[PDB]
Design an enzyme around this catalytic site. Structure first.
Site, PDB file in Angstrom:
ATOM      1  N   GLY G  30       0.697  -1.398  -0.015  1.00 54.09           N
ATOM      2  CA  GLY G  30      -0.027  -0.249  -0.009  1.00 54.09           C
ATOM      3  C   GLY G  30       0.926   1.457   0.118  1.00 54.09           C
ATOM      4  O   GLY G  30       1.971   1.323   0.122  1.00 54.09           O
ATOM      5  N   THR G  31       0.111   2.326   0.018  1.00 53.61           N
ATOM      6  CA  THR G  31       0.598   3.804  -0.011  1.00 53.61           C
ATOM      7  C   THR G  31       1.391   3.995   1.332  1.00 53.61           C
ATOM      8  O   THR G  31       0.960   3.301   2.160  1.00 53.61           O
ATOM      9  CB  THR G  31      -0.316   4.922  -0.276  1.00 53.61           C
ATOM     10  N   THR G  32       2.534   4.869   1.370  1.00 56.81           N
ATOM     11  CA  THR G  32       3.159   5.377   2.459  1.00 56.81           C
ATOM     12  C   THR G  32       2.399   6.478   3.324  1.00 56.81           C
ATOM     13  O   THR G  32       1.794   7.295   2.703  1.00 56.81           O
ATOM     14  CB  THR G  32       4.644   5.622   2.203  1.00 56.81           C
TER      15      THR G  32
END
Lengths: 243, 233, 111, 250, 242, 198, 244, 244, 241
Positions: G30-32
């Protein structure tokens, strides 16, 4: 057939592999802990390892204050450790309400051990990959160390150790008590009993400690408390002025 | 691999995937194409209806949820009936208890949270349908894309289903144009019909084949079918 | 002891013509010997060319009208926007009223 | 959540065997040796306190437990399974008997009640059988003294004398040689300590051994005086000293 | 094993697709909708000459204005007919009117996906989908004469003409060519009776085939053997004419 | 209340039950049969609360008939009365009890002896040579205490009932519109259609 | 044997719960997102991948508020993250109703902890496909926490999870070293913005949108607020200046 | 989920057989042999004790012959623990009937009720069946002396002479050979002992390995009497028949 | 608590648990029913794997649901009892509310409905039983004969058979039952029933039981002798040729 290793049912050998693998999880943290009885106190020692620099060291703990009198140190993953901690606190508060007196160390230990036994027999409940060392100065038994495991087993100790290098600590403590011929640390102050615990922790592990490498919990008459980094530093200064 | 980790929604794959959810997503791509797009005054749904035989009907793709909200389906129609009916209740509850028209954004939050519950529990299955929700609330026109994974996204325009990438690329190009179709419903619909037709291949959109719905400033969510969409063919 | 019912007075009238119908009602709402409002609407347009008034205990009256209005809404949702005929509306209200047979809406209702 | 295991985990195999019961019995066979001997005026039950560490306090662990003031129990197999069965057995003695008849249950019926509990863990949904075998010794007015064995299957049988666990076969044979229907309680205690010696590898004293008897009433252990009909419990657990004294006359 | 509401990699429900395979083994049922009424005809298909043919009930009445024909596991249809009959009468009690044909069909289709071992949505207590497809045919003042095809998938389609069962694929292709928007009830009767004869393994007669219709005037009636026997005769003569 | 009379003679049990059904001010029916056949050789008469009276009787009937089918056997008059008593003894401590008083008259084909049981709504059972529910017993029991013999024939029993009915017609305030009489013996249950003037 | 990774609550021979570890893979994918603890509050910031121009800018919010003082941000399966926040909100409301005082951050942390830990106890439920960074200001200071799919959580000076967690962690460690006295709320907002822009390099293929929220005793009165308008752009530029 | 570990105890084999029932019957075939013989003036129940020791207390023992009613007794073959569960419920049903009808429970109804309970574990519940087969010996005033048999399937039948457990085939052939309709109790007592003696898997048939019970209507009374033989009574009768 | 879907669809579109329930029926002892002009007759074969039974008390194969309706079956005995009981209860319930005994069609429809329910309910296996239901409707003299199977499907027959070797006996009946002239006598109806069983039973005077149901609750079972007489007369029909 091969599912006798997935759920808590007997193997052809009469074993429970899930219980055995739950024991394996208790060493996942790579932390050793010991407990010793003073003359009128109980001291726990647990290694403190904070790897990440981004972690707040004040939030990293495996010692828990169950009740005013009961203290508990855990060996194993922290989420399971906190699960066991909350239940023990809830059980301690209830007992007091129902029976009009503070729950003894051995009783809470038995209760938690019984509870752990259920997960050993019932299929939908998994065992907790933790070992629980309960400590207090019972109003009837005095300084008390009672320890439970994933198997649902519990017993009282003169002194005990838990972790990966458990055996070295155990045999070290064994040798001291064979020597002293008594079942406790013959000291009046808890400060010196704490010092003893750190000393034999060092000798057995073969490692020097800083004020941030350890974690101490002391149980006394009508109170259990943990030591701060400076309280430990003071204890580390005294053991230095001896060697 | 896959075969061992796609038995139920409760199982993660070694790579961290939820195949049952991805399989449910495949039922959408198998479904007929539908397009949504909005300006600042109106929001339009254009859906391609599908028939079994030349004797069968063209199964409806547009469902009304309230006077200010509605959606288009792509996938399993019964699941769309379930989710639309839940959304119908949530709009109704908001008006009866709070005398308040349900915000389109919150409607998306509720659809997301309901779909998620079917992705973490044993026994259940993920919903096998995609939804395009349009609405006009206290903050203007809206368009939402719902995925069975639980992912809801607010967009200017979008398309879901078979060949949907054609329409989606066209809208991504026509963006600066249709966003400004304010005060003219007929133009926004025409722009949506030009979008949907970029995902054709089999036939051309006929009278009993096209389905269009609109909501906006002074336009309650209304559906146009058959003779009513003839002036757009 | 708590009495769930009250009286908000008011009077309503309904006369049907050959190609029309009227539903009248005063705008006075009272409690004992005080006036609550000189203008509180009592006759409502429920859609599908149906006008309704449930006079008596206001709280029960409002709740019933609100429930029927919502019943009209769901009649469209479940039967492809079909018009709810006045005879069908009447029968629907009977069930709405008899549903609370042992805790009645303390109202005389006219549509 | 919710126990979705509503099906039996012990089922019949093509051979007619019940796997989990067989395996539960295997677990008993690995357990430390425990025995029971019935005399003419008492019953003796004994086991070895196999301390898992010299730092552990073997007193804080009772393998021999009181169920009623006239009934005691001992086991071989899984410790935690035994502990909960004792809790359950002590309670069923009240709930199913004392709270109804105003008196403690006779040995045979409490045994039958414990057997029912163990049977259910063989058929009930989502559970395993208890990994223990129990030796229950008691006395009631109308049956006198008795000794029973309860297995993981839920089956139970009366004994004049028997042993379970590690060296059961060897210990059972030794009892067959030494048993008669004219044994006094002291003689049975002597036979018990002899039979247990063969099962003990290391230290053999009153701290490595747990031994209790069902004998005469103990008015000194009652806790109160004034009711002539209440004369005290027949169950008594022998002290570390009392064991050592008898070990010198071994 | 594998869940009863599991998705295939292609985005399909196994149990629903397997349910459709059971339908294909069922007896043939044909519906024809005309501006004079909707005709329903089925293949009786007795399994033995000792079986009393008229006890085969594959065409049932939902209400006076709605009737349906079944194909597949016919025992699975009983609780569906029960729900339909109840839903029809219940609506009349609540609204003093006839239930719409589409509305009735939609209610029957709402039971279809109510299966599972604990599907998180409601209380779907049913271990498997229905093993039967229904041809629901009726009339209401809003949309006149209607023919619907209800499936265990939960979806229902409206047809001008539809064939379900064993000889469906072939019979359907026949209805494709034969149907026009100006068929008479009579024409449709012979049409059903003709297509049935083509797909039926046995030689069609008034004992192994059953006809029925639904008209605004008289409602749903099942054609007695004597009436159909003559229509079979009229068909043979018209076929032999060219 | 309605008149419910029962009398055991030598070889039969005779049940007499009033024919009137009054609701408030009007007599709605003068030909009511306040009895049910539970089995070929067991008959039960009843009186009490308007609704409960028939409902309980038909319920008991259905239960005995089900038993008779399941076992292909007729329960003894004692066994039936014991069953009925338990049902009423349950009822008394329920939310809304059956307010029904019953007389059970049956011929035991095993003992070859007639039997009469009296049970009230509380579930109070007793076996009697003759019984009555309600106000009837106040006039009848003293007659039967005087004229009853255990060896009386069925004909003697009917004459004795007639004498009771006459007393009930003379001294009772309510018009119960005569009675229906039924004989239960070794050959089953039959109705005396000529008691209007026997 | 094998197959220990097919059911949730099962221990493998090495005492591991593979299904939890598989949930981590969904998070890592996933996104940070990050959290920075300053001298009187906390700052949350997340990357928002712009899949298409059709995504309406500034509309699809990711950071969520619990009560009126707690901010939550997560990486991985977004619907799972919402589920945890929904529970957290119920959990906080239960606390306030009984104890009057708004839930302390450590208290709230354990509440989310026990709930996630519960999803590792049974095979009928799936572990959470998110790692959540949360915190706020309470009775005695500011707190920052990060929660893992295993149910494990700790207090943090700075925290990072997702695609570019390593890039972020490296940057956060530099900050801890170069500010022993403590960062300010203002500084943290800018500094956070930079960390995201730098951590985005592990996903530089797609364009992104920055989102920042904060909870400071002096700057937001101890309440959770979203960084909007001028202060956002100030941080956008600060990052866009130091990316070069 | 849990489905993985479900044995599915109540399913059909491709042949239309019930796995768990057949395997339960296989379990019974290894248990001690029990025999019931009906005579004109009474019924005889005899059972062979499976496995005995020197220290086994035979006086306080009862593992195969149980008393359900004053008029009905049972012979047990299989799991003693499973049997006692069914025995208790049977003892209850007998009393419930007595309270309801004020008459003793007719032998077949009690038998059917128990057999129906066994059938329950055969069709639903997902639980294992009871590994038990009963021989019912009873008397009522409708059929007189009656002998029934019931097995794990839930099926029951009536008999003049029957055997359950081990070596049933050999025992049944021997019974079919020497039985006569006009038999007397004492003849049946002998037949039973002879049949067991010839089917025993042990060396000699001794008293300590037997359980014996008879149901007679003691002429000098008029009522039915159940007699469960004491260890000495078994020893006597064993000599008289000519086995010693 | 247990709701595991035991009866489900397979790739080819079968319910194997229902399919295997019919295999249990195939195993069960043969049962036959033939309707005459004024009666119905039910014939059942008796097993001989074990012989030493008490015939007085051993549960018979033909059961009475009510005074006017009977039920015979083939398959698992234990399963049948459950079906007989539920049918008997519904028989009395119908009389209680409708004030009229069940029709043979209605009673059959109920029994079949119970069977169907077990094919799509959780945690239950289907009934391994197929039944024959015969009798006369209240105040009617037209004979009724119905058949049910595990699937829940039911239908009426002029003559039908279920169980082991039902394939053989059905064939006999297919070429020995004229629908134009059904056995116009009770005697010739019972005879045709015996004949059909004798094709399979293989000389079984004690292995054949027969029940005759006539209008207005007239049910009677034949004794060994009465049946053996038919067998004797039938064996002569063959030898006289």
């Amino acid at each position: 057939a091969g599912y006798d290793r997935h759920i808590t049912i007997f193997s052809p050998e009469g074993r429970l592999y899930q219980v055995e693998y739950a024991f394996k999880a208790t060493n996942q943290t790579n932390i050793n802990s010991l407990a010793v009885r003073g003359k009128d106190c109980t001291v726990v020692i647990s290694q403190k390892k904070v790897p990440d620099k981004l972690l707040d060291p004040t939030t990293v703990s495996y010692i828990f204050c169950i009740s005013r009198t009961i203290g508990m140190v855990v060996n194993g993953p922290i989420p399971d450790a906190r699960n066991a901690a909350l239940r023990a606190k809830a059980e301690a508060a209830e007992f007091r309400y129902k029976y009009g007196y503070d729950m003894p160390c051995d009783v809470l230990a038995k209760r938690m051990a019984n509870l752990s036994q259920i997960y050993t027999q019932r299929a939908y409940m998994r065992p907790l990959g933790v070992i629980l060392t309960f400590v207090s100065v019972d109003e009837e038994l005095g300084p008390s160390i009672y320890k439970t495991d994933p198997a649902g087993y519990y017993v009282g100790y003169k002194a005990t150790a838990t972790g990966p290098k458990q055996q070295e600590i155990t045999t070290n403590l064994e040798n001291h008590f064979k020597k002293s011929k008594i079942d406790h640390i013959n000291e009046e102050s808890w400060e010196k009993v704490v010092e003893f615990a750190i000393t034999h922790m060092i000798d057995a592990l073969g490692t020097e400690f800083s004020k941030n490498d350890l974690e101490v919990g002391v149980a006394t008459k009508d109170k259990f408390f943990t030591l701060s980094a400076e309280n430990i530093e003071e204890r580390l200064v005294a053991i230095a002025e001896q060697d | 691999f896959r075969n061992n980790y796609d038995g139920d929604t409760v199982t993660f794959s070694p790579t961290g995937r939820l195949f049952q959810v991805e399989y449910a997503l495949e039922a959408i791509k198998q479904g007929s194409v539908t397009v949504g797009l909005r300006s600042n005054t109106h929001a339009v749904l254009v859906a391609l209806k599908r028939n079994a035989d030349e004797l069968s009907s063209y199964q409806k793709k547009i469902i009304k949820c309230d006077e200010h909200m509605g959606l288009s389906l792509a996938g399993l129609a019964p699941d769309a009936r379930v989710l639309s009916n839940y959304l119908r209740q949530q709009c109704n509850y908001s008006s009866l208890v709070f005398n308040r028209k349900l915000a389109v954004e919150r409607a998306g939050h509720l659809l997301c949270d309901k779909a998620q519950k079917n992705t973490q529990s044993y026994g259940g299955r993920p919903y096998g349908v995609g939804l395009l929700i349009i609405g006009y609330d206290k903050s203007g026109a809206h368009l939402l894309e719902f995925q069975p994974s639980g992912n809801v996204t607010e967009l200017y325009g979008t398309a879901i289903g078979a060949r949907s990438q054609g329409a989606k690329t066209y809208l991504e190009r026509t963006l600066d144009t249709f966003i400004k179709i304010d005060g003219n419903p007929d133009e926004l619909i025409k722009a949506g019909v030009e979008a949907i037709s970029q995902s054709l291949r089999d036939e051309s959109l006929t009278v009993d084949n096209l389905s269009i719905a609109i909501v906006g400033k002074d336009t309650p969510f209304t559906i146009y079918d058959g003779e009513a969409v003839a002036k757009y063919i | 002891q708590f009495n769930p019912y009250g009286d908000n007075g008011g009077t309503i009238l309904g006369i049907a013509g050959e190609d029309f119908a009227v539903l009248a009602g005063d705008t006075r709402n009272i409690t004992d010997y005080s006036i609550n409002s000189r203008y509180e609407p009592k006759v409502f347009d429920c859609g599908d060319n149906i006008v309704m008034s449930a006079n008596g205990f206001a709280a029960d009256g409002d709740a019933l009208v609100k429930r029927f209005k919502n019943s009209v809404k769901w009649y469209h949702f479940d039967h492809n926007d079909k018009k709810l005929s006045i005879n069908s509306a009447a029968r629907n209200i009977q069930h709405l009223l008899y549903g609370k047979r042992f805790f009645p809406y303390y109202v005389h209702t006219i549509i | 959540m919710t126990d979705r295991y509503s099906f039996s985990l012990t089922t019949f195999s093509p051979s007619g065997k019940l796997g989990q019961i067989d395996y539960a019995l295997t677990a008993v066979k690995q357990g430390v040796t425990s025995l029971g001997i019935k005399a003419t005026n008492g019953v003796v039950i004994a086991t070895e306190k196999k301390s898992s560490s010299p730092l552990a306090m073997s007193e804080t662990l009772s393998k021999v437990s009181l169920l009623t003031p006239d009934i005691g129990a001992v086991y071989s197999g899984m410790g935690p399974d035994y502990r909960v069965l004792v809790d359950k057995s002590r309670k069923v003695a009240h709930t199913s008997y004392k709270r109804i008849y105003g008196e403690y249950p006779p040995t045979k019926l409490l045994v039958s009640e414990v057997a029912k509990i163990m049977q259910e863990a063989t058929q009930s949904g989502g559970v395993r059988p208890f990994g223990v075998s129990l030796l229950i010794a008691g006395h009631d007015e109308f049956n006198g003294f008795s000794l029973y064995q309860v297995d993981p299957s839920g089956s139970y049988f009366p004994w004049k004398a028997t042993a379970i666990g590690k060296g059961s076969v060897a210990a059972k044979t030794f009892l067959e040689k030494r048993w008669n229907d004219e044994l006094e309680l002291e003689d049975a205690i002597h036979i018990a300590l002899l039979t247990l010696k063969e099962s003990v590898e290391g230290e053999f004293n009153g701290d490595t051994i747990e031994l209790a008897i069902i004998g005469d009433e103990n008015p000194d252990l009652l806790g109160y005086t004034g009711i002539p009909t209440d004369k005290g419990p027949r169950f008594r657990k022998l002290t570390s000293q009392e064991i050592n004294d008898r070990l010198e006359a071994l | 094993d594998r869940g009863v509401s599991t998705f295939s990699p292609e985005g399909r429900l196994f149990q629903v697709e397997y349910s459709l395979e059971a339908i294909k083994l069922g007896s043939t049922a044909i519906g024809i909708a005309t501006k004079e009424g909707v005709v329903l005809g089925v293949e009786k298909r007795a399994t033995s000459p000792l079986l009393e043919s008229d006890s085969i009930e594959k065409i049932v009445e939902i209400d006076r204005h709605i009737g349906c024909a079944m194909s597949g596991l016919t025992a699975d249809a009983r609780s569906m007919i029960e729900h339909a009959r109840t839903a029809a009468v219940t609506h009349n009690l609540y609204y003093d009117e006839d239930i719409n044909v589409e509305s009735l069909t939609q209610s029957v289709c709402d039971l279809a996906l109510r299966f599972g071992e604990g599907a998180s949505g409601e209380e779907r207590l049913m271990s498997r989908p229905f093993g039967v497809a229904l041809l629901i045919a009726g009339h209401d003042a809003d949309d006149g004469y209607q023919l619907f095809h209800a499936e265990p998938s939960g979806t229902f389609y409206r047809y001008n003409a539809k064939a379900i069962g064993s000889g469906s694929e072939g019979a359907q292709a026949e209805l494709l060519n034969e149907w026009h928007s100006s068929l008479t009830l009579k024409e449709a009767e012979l049409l059903v009776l003709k297509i049935l004869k083509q797909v039926m393994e046995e030689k069609l007669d008034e004992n192994n085939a059953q006809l029925s219709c639904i008209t605004k005037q008289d409602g749903f009636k099942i054609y007695d053997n004597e009436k159909t026997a003559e229509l079979i005769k009229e068909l043979k003569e018209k076929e032999a004419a060219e | 209340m309605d008149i419910i009379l029962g009398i055991r003679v030598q070889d039969s049990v005779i049940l007499a039950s009033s024919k009137a059904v009054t609701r408030g001010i009007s007599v709605l029916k003068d030909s009511d049969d306040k009895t049910r056949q539970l089995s070929p050789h067991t008959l039960m008469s009843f009186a009490g609360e308007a609704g409960d009276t028939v409902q309980f009787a038909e319920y008991i009937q259905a239960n005995i008939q089900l038993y008779s089918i399941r076992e292909d056997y007729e329960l003894s008059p004692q066994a039936v009365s014991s069953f009925v008593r338990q049902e009423l003894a349950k009822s008394i401590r329920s939310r809304r009890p059956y307010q029904v008083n019953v007389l059970i008259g049956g011929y035991d084909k095993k003992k070859n002896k007639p039997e009469l049981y009296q049970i009230d709504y509380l579930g109070t059972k007793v076996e009697l040579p003759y019984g009555a529910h309600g106000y009837s017993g106040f006039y009848t029991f003293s007659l039967l205490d005087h004229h009853y013999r255990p060896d009386m024939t069925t004909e003697e029993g009917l004459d004795l009932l007639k004498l009771c009915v006459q007393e009930l017609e003379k001294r009772m305030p309510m018009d119960f519109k005569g009675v229906i009489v039924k004989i239960v013996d070794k050959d089953g249950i039959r109705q005396v259609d000529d008691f209007q003037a026997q | 044997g094998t197959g220990y990774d097919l059911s949730n609550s099962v221990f493998s021979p090495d005492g591991r719960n593979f299904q939890v570890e598989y949930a981590v893979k969904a998070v890592e994918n996933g996104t940070t997102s990050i959290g920075i603890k300053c001298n009187d509050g906390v700052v949350f910031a997340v990357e928002k991948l712009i899949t298409s121009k059709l995504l309406v800018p500034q509309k699809n919010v990711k950071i969520q508020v619990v009560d009126r003082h707690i901010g939550c941000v997560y990486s991985g399966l977004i619907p799972d993250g919402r589920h945890l926040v929904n529970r957290g909100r119920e959990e906080a409301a239960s606390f306030k109703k009984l104890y009057k005082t708004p839930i302390p951050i450590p208290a709230f942390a354990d509440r989310l902890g026990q709930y996630v830990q519960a999803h590792t106890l049974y095979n009928s439920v799936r572990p959470f496909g998110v790692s959540t960074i949360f915190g706020g200001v309470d009775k005695n200071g500011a707190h920052l926490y990060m929660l893992e799919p295993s149910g494990s959580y700790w207090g943090y000076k700075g925290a990072a999870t997702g695609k570019g967690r390593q890039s972020a962690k490296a940057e956060l460690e530099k900050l801890v070293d170069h500010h022993p006295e403590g960062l300010s709320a203002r500084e943290a907002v800018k500094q956070a913005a930079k960390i995201i822009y730098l951590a985005h390099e592990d996903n530089k293929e797609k364009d992104f949108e920055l989102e920042i929220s904060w909870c400071s005793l002096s700057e937001t009165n101890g309440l959770h607020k979203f960084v909007k308008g001028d202060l956002l752009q100030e941080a956008i530029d600060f990052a866009q200046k130091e990316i070069n | 989920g849990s489905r993985r570990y479900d044995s599915r105890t109540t399913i059909f084999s491709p042949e239309g057989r019930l796995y768990q029932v057949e395997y339960a019957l296989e379990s019974i075939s290894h248990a001690g042999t029990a025999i019931g013989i009906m005579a004109s003036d009474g019924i005889v129940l005899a059972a062979e004790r499976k496995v005995t020791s020197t220290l086994l207390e035979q006086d306080t023992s009862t593992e195969k012959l149980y008393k359900l009613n004053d008029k009905i007794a049972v012979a047990v073959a299989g799991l003693t623990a499973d049997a006692e569960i069914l025995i208790n419920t049977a003892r209850i049903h007998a009393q419930n009937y007595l309270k309801t009808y004020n008459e003793d429970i007719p032998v077949e109804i009690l038998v059917r009720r128990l057999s129906d309970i066994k059938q329950g574990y055969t069709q639903h519940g997902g639980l294992r069946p009871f590994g038990v087969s009963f021989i019912y010996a009873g008397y009522d005033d409708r059929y007189g002396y009656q002998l029934y048999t019931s097995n794990p399937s839930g099926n029951y039948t009536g008999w003049k002479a029957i055997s359950v457990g081990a070596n049933t085939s050999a025992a049944q052939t021997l019974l079919q050979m020497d039985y006569k309709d006009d038999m007397k109790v004492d003849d049946a007592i002998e037949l039973a002992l002879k049949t067991l003696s010839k089917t025993t898997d042990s060396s000699a048939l001794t008293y300590d390995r037997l359980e014996f019970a008879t149901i007679r209507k003691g002429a000098n009374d008029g009522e039915v009497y159940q007699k469960i033989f004491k260890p000495q009574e078994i020893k006597d009768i064993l000599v008289k028949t000519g086995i010693t | 608590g247990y709701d595991r879907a035991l009866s489900i669809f397979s790739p080819d579109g079968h319910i194997f648990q229902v399919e295997y329930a019919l295999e249990a029926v195939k195993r069960g002892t043969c049962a036959v029913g033939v309707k005459g002009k004024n009666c119905v007759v039910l014939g059942c074969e008796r097993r001989s794997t074990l012989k030493l039974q008490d015939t007085r008390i051993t549960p018979s194969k033909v059961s009475k649901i009510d005074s006017h309706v009977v039920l015979s079956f083939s398959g698992l005995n234990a399963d049948s009892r459950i079906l007989i009981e539920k049918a008997r209860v519904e028989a009395q319930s119908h009389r209680l509310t409708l004030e009229d005994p069940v029709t043979v069609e209605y009673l059959t429809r109920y029994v079949a409905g119970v069977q169907q329910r077990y094919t799509q309910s959780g945690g239950v296996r289907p009934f391994g039983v197929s039944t024959l239901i015969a009798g006369f409707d209240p105040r009617d003299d037209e004979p009724k004969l119905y058949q049910t199977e595990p699937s829940g499907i039911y239908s009426s027959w002029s003559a039908q058979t279920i169980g082991r070797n039902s394939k053989t006996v059905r064939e006999f009946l297919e070429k020995n039952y004229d629908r134009k002239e059904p056995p116009a006598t009770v005697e010739e109806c019972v005879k045709l029933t015996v004949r059909s069983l004798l094709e399979v039973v293989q000389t079984g005077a004690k292995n054949i039981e027969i029940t005759v149901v006539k209008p207005d609750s007239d049910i009677v079972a034949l004794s060994s002798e009465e049946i053996n007489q038919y067998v004797t007369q039938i064996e002569q029909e063959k030898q006289e040729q």
